[PDB]
Amino acid sequence: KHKILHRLLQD
Amino acid sequence: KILHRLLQD
Amino acid sequence: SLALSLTADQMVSALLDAEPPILYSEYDPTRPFSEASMMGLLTNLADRELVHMINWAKRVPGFVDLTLHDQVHLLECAWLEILMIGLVWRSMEHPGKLLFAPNLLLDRNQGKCVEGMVEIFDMLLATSSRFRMMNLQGEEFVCLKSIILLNSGVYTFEEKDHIHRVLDKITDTLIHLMAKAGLTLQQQHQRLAQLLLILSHIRHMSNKGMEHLYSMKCKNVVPLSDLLLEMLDAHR
Amino acid sequence: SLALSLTADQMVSALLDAEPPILYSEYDPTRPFSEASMMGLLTNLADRELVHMINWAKRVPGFVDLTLHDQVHLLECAWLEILMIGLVWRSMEHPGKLLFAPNLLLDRNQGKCVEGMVEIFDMLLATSSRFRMMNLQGEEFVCLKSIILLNSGVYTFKDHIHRVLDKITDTLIHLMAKAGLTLQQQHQRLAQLLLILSHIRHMSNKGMEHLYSMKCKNVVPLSDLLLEMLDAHR
Ligand SMILES: CC/C(=C(/CC)c1ccc(O)cc1)c1ccc(O)cc1
Ligand SMILES: CC/C(=C(/CC)c1ccc(O)cc1)c1ccc(O)cc1
């Protein structure tokens, strides 16, 4: 699923 | 309070 | 204080001698499961355990030196953590199952009989798996359980200074045990930390369980005992 | 993993260097606060802190070696514990007060502005006082905060995380032996510190429920990020 947390962790 | 009583005796 | 005079071995012996018994459930394996019946079983069991727990706490070194008000608070704080760590200890040699009583051994699928209970079962099972992993000893278990009694409500209250002194004595005890088990100084500190970190997850389970228990009370599917209701209301 | 090869001193520096910055709140000096305004300030702050927290987490030795899902799990489990222990740490030198931000230092009674918040404030204030009396050091603090990150979600999943957890314990002990504490004082303090983590868990769980209620009460719009971190606990 889309997760703002995913983005922050990957960035 | 039950706990209070049970603690007492 | 008598608690401050006990040696490590004397501490272990006192804690072991104070162990509550393992109660049976009113469980009848002939009448299968409903949400109301299992909840009944679990809460009935907890109610009976609670009476033993209260009399056990009095035998925990240092606990009798506290004011009555402080005793009530600690037990009100810790009662479900203590029920849970006992449960996890019992279940340690039953992989995938929670031994609530010798005649009531449940895996997670039965936890689905009650709404949201399976989340709690899973956490308890993971904790039992952890104890199994660590090869947790009974001597260590009784130390941890008394730490929970004294520690969980100590931040929500001289009186505390006494408690922290007893807590320290139990730390001394855990370390003495590990040194006897042939553990190096490093291994002692590592195991010590490992044991105390588990108490964080035990708090977490109690917190969730308390919320689940409160919701069931409002759901009104099975009569909770007077003592359990009072304990439950002590968290609100 | 690279974390296990690190020495104790190297671990302390790595953690110290990963520390997030102390962010500010809004400079609107209108007092007192309303419920909505205090709620707005707190949630706005936590929102911005969360972004830095993720940066911090990725710099916690061993955390990068975890899969993305594991990282996500640990952070979703521990995020409020981590905000709170940081809050409590910052508030240590301000007895009776919570230093949410340098320009947002709140006393006990200001917690009354939000219903059910004063109970959370009292628990945080007691935790800060406990840290104060223990003379908690920054090196110990960062070790504890890392422990929370790695430990709180590890039983809701192992060896790698637990090895790193062991590494921090070693690091903690190393710090205490450094301060001249005796062996008995060393494990006694170790125990005292780790037991406070149980109370931090309790506070987080209390705070999580309060946040959830405020979501349902719809007093203040919560960010998608904060909502998602919150959704992970229900
Ligand atoms: C997890 C079930 C449980 C309880 C304690 C009453 C429970 C029951 C129903 C709920 O909705 C929540 C918790 C319990 C009972 C006895 C033990 O020795 C340990 C745990
Ligand atoms: C306790 C307030 C709080 C939060 C985090 C969002 C909160 C806000 C409103 C609630 O109803 C409950 C908790 C928080 C915010 C920033 C921190 O660094 C630490 C804690």
Residue numbers in the entry:
A (entry chain D): 686 to 696
B (entry chain C): 688 to 696
C (entry chain B): 305 to 461, 470 to 548
D (entry chain A): 305 to 461, 472 to 548
Pull text from the paper.
ERα contains structurally conserved globular domains of the nuclear receptor superfamily, including a DNA‐binding domain (DBD) that is connected by a flexible hinge region to the ligand‐binding domain (LBD), as well as unstructured AB and F domains at its amino and carboxyl termini, respectively. The LBD contains a ligand‐dependent coactivator‐binding site called activation function‐2 (AF‐2). AF‐2 binds the signature LxxLL motif peptides of coactivators such as NCOA1/2/3 (also known as SRC‐1/2/3). In the canonical model of the ERα signaling pathway, E2‐bound ERα forms a homodimer that binds DNA at estrogen‐response elements (EREs), recruits NCOA1/2/3 (Metivier et al, 2003; Johnson & O'Malley, 2012), and activates the GREB1 gene, which is required for proliferation of ERα‐positive breast cancer cells (Ghosh et al, 2000; Rae et al, 2005; Deschenes et al, 2007; Liu et al, 2012; Srinivasan et al, 2013).
To overcome barriers to crystallization of ERα LBD complexes, we developed a conformation‐trapping X‐ray crystallography approach using the ERα‐Y537S mutation (Nettles et al, 2008; Bruning et al, 2010; Srinivasan et al, 2013). To further validate this approach, we solved the structure of the ERα‐Y537S LBD in complex with diethylstilbestrol (DES), which bound identically in the wild‐type and ERα‐Y537S LBDs, demonstrating again that this surface mutation stabilizes h12 dynamics to facilitate crystallization without changing ligand binding (Nettles et al, 2008; Bruning et al, 2010; Delfosse et al, 2012). Using this approach, we solved 76 ERα LBD structures in the active conformation and bound to ligands studied here. Eleven of these structures have been published, while 65 are new, including the DES‐bound ERα‐Y537S LBD.
